[PDB]
């Protein structure tokens, strides 16, 4: 059980938190209200999006918020490759035992949430294999059998939703899909605020500019770094996408920004601050540290095309309409009057 | 699947119901006539009509009706894009396996309907294998092959040749009357209703439900500023506005109903007064149209056909709401 | 410290498994354990591989493999620094080389180090290794400097030492000469110039990104009437 996580830690995702509250918290909080309108509670919620966008964060946050919201709830986390045994037996026995225990805890009255992380490992598909081929049938049967129980809820997360076979994703079992998009400027500011806390030491030079107003200095710094990161400067060019009918596309870093990258930027800035206090003896943090962290992160992620995802390419090709032909990694006349 | 979808379940499709009856149930009462005449009843029904709506629901209804006539029922549903196994003839093997299972089911004396969906994605190719399997299953007249496709133009006419898939049936969008029908099917009389709205109808719950359904259908089928969902440009450049009446679908209406129920529950748990209000329906309509702006309309790919086939003319640019020109 | 070496065999991108081996079951376990349901400190995983493209994007996601370090081809100053590691004052030196420096071994060693790099990175006709034709059809003459490495430096030093040993065995004069280094470097370039495909595709991608043009041809630089 993972404690110490809540929706207050997650920033920039407002609609998705409300939706996950509606799908999970609301049926537990109100059951007779649902029965009055003959609205069956959603049984399955899947989370998909670019990597590192906060699927596991939302999962643990909702797991803790279900316990805190009620006026004893049990959260179960199980991974795919965990329920694989080299012997012919126990490949299916473990899953059936897990679901039987979930039903037992439901009978006890405590709501139970099962979290299937990295659903690409298992339940992906059976046709393309190039027994694992016998995992999704009994799992679907068990989910159909447990659907009648009101308090049982199944939660799944996956980076690649395409690899998952639609049979488990048909209306019924996995009826709810939630997409976690890459953060935008306001979401980036919220995420930065979630980490740039007033408890971190601040150098006297920056603090004096606000007459000791820590909150004003911190929020001004957050806005400044957000503006710096999302700016379309020539230094921010990341990729060149080529279309034969089209002239070409230009991709910046902001198109692949994520909360994990913001956290690493803050961590690198704090490391630079520690090195500064070791080398000069002046404690605190500076804006120059944040700018250097930003530029170092951009240079570090410049070479790797790792930031790109199949979802990102699908969005780009559904935006331009033309299939990509080439991707190039950008890196650094006359008589003008 | 459970044959739980009756004729009363589907509304606005009465002519479609009668066409399906003519295509399916008629030879059963005249099997001796075909046997005397040495004939072959047609077992091919191609249901081509609107996009995501209730097109597949008609297949669930004929299965239920056929279950009623012989008074145990199997419905083999296959999706089309997921059937594709592009690499090297794997898709042909999968089609053979599906038809072998259909033959095994036909061995038992239970009617089986083999339904294929989204067949416009596909069609020297897999088409000859499909035709061979259809010819092989033709001997099993109890098994009924039902195909669905939203783009009849893209479908290869080889499957449309006389013989196997002779019967083609067109499907339509939910009409205002059909919308009132479908709204009544979910908004039943057992749903709670507001006392203030009851004051307008002296406590007649059925009349109140009917009036509320009429009101919501009229508002959703109206040309107002609240129905700016789609803006259409043309080669001629006559920029026009589509309204919530267009692109209406039963599945979306069910989602609107679900969102309205959720909003009503929220209002009950917040304000305290139980019941249903037209504000809940309007908010559900707005939220569900905001959600539905995503699924069919990324607006660069495949939307041009998705609007041109229904409207009837190619549209150069679609949107969602040099120089020296004079 | 858990050191994963050659993270190409495992940690492969999910899917694209033309070979029947299934990487879609092992690498999710690594992703789940490295990230962890609960964050765990005091354990650092270090991964070294020369094929960064084949690695799955989820592994290289920041906050999971946040520290990323690229080691590049050495330049002239880096070449001198690497040579200083192998050419040490403890290595025997021929009397002729020590003669002009009046017994000061450090000056002779650093002079020889400078002389070797002076020709290794020199751009002359004899050092033209490869020629590349771009989409525009323009051609660039790449020298051995663009494909130089520390391993090449070590191989050159070892070949020079072997030549010195041969000279001592045959003639009987102890010591290592600069001409031995020149012979070693020219022989090493001749050996390595026969193979056109000796670098990973990342170098070609970097060249294409720098030039801005698509690479279509590679060539090795091995070598009707009325006339009065």
């Amino acid at each position: 059980e993972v404690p110490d996580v809540s929706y207050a830690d997650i920033g920039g995702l407002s609609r998705q938190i409300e939706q996950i509250r509606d799908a999970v918290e609301l049926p537990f909080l109100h059951k007779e209200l649902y029965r009055e309108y003959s609205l069956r509670p959603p049984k399955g919620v899947l989370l998909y999006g670019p990597p590192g966008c906060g699927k596991t964060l939302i999962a643990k946050a909702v797991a803790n918020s279900l316990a805190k919201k009620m006026a004893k709830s049990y959260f179960l986390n199980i991974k795919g490759p965990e329920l694989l045994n080299k012997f012919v037996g126990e490949t299916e026995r473990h899953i059936r035992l897990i679901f039987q225990r979930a039903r037992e805890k439901a009978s006890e009255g405590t709501p139970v949430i099962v979290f299937f992380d990295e659903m690409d490992s298992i339940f992906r598909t059976r046709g393309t294999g190039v027994v694992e081929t016998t995992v999704v049938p009994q799992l679907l049967s068990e989910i159909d059998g447990v659907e009648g129980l009101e308090n049982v809820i199944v939660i799944g997360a996956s980076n690649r939703e395409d690899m998952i076979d639609p049979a488990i994703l048909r209306p019924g079992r996995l009826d709810v899909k939630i997409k976690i998009e890459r953060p935008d400027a306001e979401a980036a500011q919220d995420i930065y605020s979630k980490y740039l806390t007033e408890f971190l030491p601040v150098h006297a030079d920056d603090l004096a500019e606000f007459d000791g107003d820590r909150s004003a200095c911190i929020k001004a710094m957050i806005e400044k770094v957000v503006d710096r990161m999302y700016a379309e400067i020539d230094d921010n060019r990341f990729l060149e996408v080529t279309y034969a009918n089209g002239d070409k596309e230009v991709m910046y870093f902001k198109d692949f920004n994520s909360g994990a990258m913001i956290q690493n930027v803050v961590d690198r800035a704090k490391k630079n601050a520690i090195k500064s206090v070791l080398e000069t003896g002046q404690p605190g943090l500076r804006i120059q540290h944040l700018l250097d962290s930003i530029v170092d992160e951009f240079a570090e992620n410049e070479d790797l095309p790792n930031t790109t995802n199949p979802d990102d390419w699908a969005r780009i090709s559904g935006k331009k309409g033309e299939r990509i032909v080439y991707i190039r990694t950008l890196v650094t006349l006359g008589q003008y009057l | 699947e459970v044959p739980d979808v009756s004729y009363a379940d589907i509304g606005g499709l009465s002519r479609q119901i009668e066409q399906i009856r003519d295509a399916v149930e008629l030879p059963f009462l005249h099997k001796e006539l075909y046997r005397e005449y040495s004939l072959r009843p047609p077992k091919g029904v191609l249901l081509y009509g609107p996009p995501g709506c209730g097109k597949t629901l008609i297949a669930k209804a004929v299965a239920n009706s056929l279950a009623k006539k012989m008074a145990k029922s199997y419905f083999l549903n296959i999706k089309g894009p997921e059937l594709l196994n592009k690499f090297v003839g794997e898709t042909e093997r999968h089609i053979r396996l599906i038809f072998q299972r259909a033959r095994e089911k036909a061995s038992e004396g239970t009617p089986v309907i083999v339904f294929f969906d989204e067949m416009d994605s596909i069609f020297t190719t897999v088409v000859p294998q499909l035709l061979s399997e259809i010819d092989g299953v033709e001997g099993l007249e109890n098994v009924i092959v039902i195909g669905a496709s939203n783009r009849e133009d893209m479908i290869d006419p080889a499957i449309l040749r006389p013989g196997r898939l002779d019967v083609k049936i067109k499907i339509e969008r939910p009409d205002a009357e059909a919308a009132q029908d479908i709204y009544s099917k979910y908004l039943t009389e057992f749903l709670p209703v507001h006392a203030d709205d009851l004051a307008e109808f002296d406590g007649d719950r059925s009349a109140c439900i009917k009036a509320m359904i009429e009101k919501v259908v009229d508002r959703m089928y109206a040309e107002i500023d609240d129905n700016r969902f789609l803006e259409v440009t043309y080669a001629n450049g006559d920029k026009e506005v589509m309204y919530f009446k267009d692109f209406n679908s039963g599945a979306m209406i069910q989602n609107v109903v679900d969102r309205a129920k959720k909003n009503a529950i929220k209002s009950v748990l917040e304000t305290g007064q139980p019941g249903l209000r037209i504000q809940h329906l309007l908010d559900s309509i707005v939220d569900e149209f905001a959600e539905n702006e995503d699924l069919p309309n990324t607006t660069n790919p495949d939307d041009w056909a998705r609007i041109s086939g229904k409207k009837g003319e190619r549209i150069v640019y679609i949107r969602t709401l040099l120089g020296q020109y004079l | 410290i858990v050191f994963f070496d050659e993270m190409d065999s495992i940690f492969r991108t999910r899917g694209t498994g033309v070979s029947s081996d299934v990487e879609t079951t092992v690498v999710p376990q690594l992703l789940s354990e490295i990230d962890g349901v609960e964050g765990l400190e005091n354990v650092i995983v270090i991964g070294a591989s020369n094929r960064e493209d084949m690695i799955d994007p989820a592994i290289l996601r920041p906050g999971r493999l946040d520290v990323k370090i690229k080691i590049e081809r050495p330049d002239a100053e880096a070449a001198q620094d690497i040579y200083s590691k192998y050419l040490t004052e403890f290595l025997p030196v021929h009397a002729d080389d020590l003669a002009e420096f009046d017994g000061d071994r450090s000056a002779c060693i650093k002079a020889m180090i400078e002389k070797v790099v002076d020709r290794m990175y020199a751009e002359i006709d004899d050092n033209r290794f490869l020629e590349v034709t771009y989409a525009n059809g323009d051609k660039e003459v790449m020298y051995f400097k663009d494909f130089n490495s520390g391993a090449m430096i070590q191989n050159v030093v070892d070949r020079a030492k072997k030549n010195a040993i041969k000279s001592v065995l045959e003639t009987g004069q102890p010591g290592l000469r600069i001409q031995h280094l020149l012979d070693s470097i020219v022989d090493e370039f001749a050996e390595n110039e026969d193979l056109p495909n000796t670098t990973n595709p990342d170098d070609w991608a970097r060249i294409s990104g720098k030039k801005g043009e698509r690479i279509v041809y590679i060539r090795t630089l091995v070598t009707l009437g009325q006339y009065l």
Binding site: K86, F87, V88, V130 | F87, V88 | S20, D21, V22
Partner: peptide, 17 residues
């Protein structure tokens, strides 16, 4: 349009006498 070659994964099996 390509061909594949299979690598098997042995499953555990044990018997007594």
């Amino acid at each position: 349009g390509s061909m594949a070659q299979e690598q098997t994964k042995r499953g555990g099996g044990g018997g007594d006498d």
